[PDB]
Amino acid sequence: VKELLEAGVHFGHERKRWNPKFARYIYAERNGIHIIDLQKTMEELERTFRFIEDLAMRGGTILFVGTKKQAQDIVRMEAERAGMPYVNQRWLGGMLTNFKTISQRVHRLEELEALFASPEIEERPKKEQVRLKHELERLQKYLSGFRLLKRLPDAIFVVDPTKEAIAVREARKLFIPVIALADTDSDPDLVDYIIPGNDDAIRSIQLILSRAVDLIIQARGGVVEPSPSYALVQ
């Protein structure tokens, strides 16, 4: 059932903008495009899940990251749909590496979250209302998903690792295990658990985010139907 799925419209990407380290992961170059070998993506999607599973069922949280408009939303879903921390906006630096401090911004979201519903607003000149509002607005804008666990993610799942490599660095400098969906655009070596496949067309993104967040909850109970994806999906 997987083969026909991926191969359907979810394989082979980046062309000639490649990176030689991604060789063991290729069939050939069709019409110019690099066509990754799918037969190995299984053996790799496998081992990857082998790692997800043996974590979902040991109650440890996973940070999802994606900041590209071709794959932002389709993660905000699978994250809420797993109740897991995620990053949809600009993955600000040092979020992990400098946790204690970025966190201090979260404790500013709830500093306003509770001074939202309150009688203290009867006052505060129109100045601080526009201000404190805006401040909660953006605070929120960037930290919608970076609240969740106030603890260092036991691992991290990421779309284009070369995109949010900054992130990958942080995790890597902290020994935090790293899973991610990289293509030819991305250098394998520096990813602990590797998902070799498309990283742009919203097709392959949902197919691997889905069955990943699906295999997440299948170690907690609650097997459901697929998640919101089609709404204008081509």
Place this chain on the structure above:
Amino acid sequence: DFEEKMILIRRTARMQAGGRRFRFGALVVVGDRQGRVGLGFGKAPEVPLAVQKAGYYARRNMVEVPLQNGTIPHEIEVEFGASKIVLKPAAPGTGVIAGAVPRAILELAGVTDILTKELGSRNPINIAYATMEALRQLRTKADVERLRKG
């Protein structure tokens, strides 16, 4: 909490319209003497602060020193850029012979017997880094043949 000995402190400085500002730097080593040592460089607007920061990174960045009889497993040379270092193990009851830096490290490294020599740039800082990376690169009959399985 470990040993924490302070290698050196320095007042650096930069220019700017009006006058020259300052800053202080701190090489600090740290040890239990069971083969766990840590090096850290700390710069801050004040002497006290600097040293604090020193121990902090030190405790962050330490390494397993595979002792033996109180000395070291095998001999090593290491260049850190310009500054080179010789670590050569001595028989029981020699002494830790090195300069302030390589000793100050090697002491809380829990070593006692070890012949050593600085070479090239004898820049404290850069010798320091050398001394560590030297250690780091140590091996034992064990973890050696561990790589020569098959």
Place this chain on the structure above:
Amino acid sequence: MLTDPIADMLTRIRNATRVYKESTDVPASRFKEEILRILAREGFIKGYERVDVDGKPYLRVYLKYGPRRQGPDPRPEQVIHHIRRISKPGRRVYVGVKEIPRVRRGLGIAILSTSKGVLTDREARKLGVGGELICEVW
């Protein structure tokens, strides 16, 4: 035109591993064999087979490296960190058996040719001989 084919091989090896690579092919020779036949017997390589590239007989030599690693630069430790030739073509180095080096404090090997075969630091000391200290590996 290769001056000392060995220090070449020796380097080919050295160079292949810095990037971590399946194998590499020193052009063949009974002596390059013999030498390889000790890197492997001593656990520095997986070993080696004979091959061909247009009637040209090289030696496929399969390297050995460490386990992956956590933290940044997860690249494996090397089975062969260091390998530098001695007794060079522009200056042969020989040794009596008492003159034989004690590499890396036992942790290392000093391959070396002699009248009774290409022994090693221990193999020679034990066999009680010396000769052209070919190179040191570890």
Place this chain on the structure above:
RNA sequence: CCUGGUCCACCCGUGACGCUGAGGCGCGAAAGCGUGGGGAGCAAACCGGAUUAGAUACCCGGGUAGUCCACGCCCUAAACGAUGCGCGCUAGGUCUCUGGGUCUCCUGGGGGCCGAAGCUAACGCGUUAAGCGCGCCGCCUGGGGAGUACGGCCGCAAGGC
């Protein structure tokens, strides 16, 4: 017209006949020297006009060697990639010159740029290495004194080594 080097393609011939290279020899920009031509433009020197405190300069008007040619010297240079030569090995991306192919592609030589790994004091280098190695030559060993002095060889001299 005479002639050098050089790349490719076919795998034909020779069978290691190789690499480097102290001395030696040859070449060696410009300026300069000798003999003889040549001389339009330009132009050290030199003459004037300005500027200027001065202006043996910068700007303007003139102008001789020289710049050209033949033959013979001179033998220097930021003679620069400030990177000796030969060979093996160590990601690719891109554009470019020029070869060969059952030519959207591949492969060989050359010239650039960005860059793995690695080197690096840094700057940077990076299959055109400053990487990793071997061979052989050359050269360095604080600044000034000084490329001076003496000696020696070379040169008509200037002067060179």
Place this chain on the structure above:
RNA sequence: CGUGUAGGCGGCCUGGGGCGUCCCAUGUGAAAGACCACGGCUCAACCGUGGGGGAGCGUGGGAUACGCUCAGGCUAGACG
């Protein structure tokens, strides 16, 4: 910047020699000093005794992987 004399450096395989090279034996390597022990002077310095070594070099025997030499073959260098 070239060219090249001397010299330095020399691709794959087979064999002969065994110069380098390696091992064994024997001779030599005086003694004094040095070093390890033991003692002689009240200790020590000094000093006696004993032991252990020293590269070198001569001689005899052996080894033949690497270097050299001679002999045969090869074509990946080089040349045509």
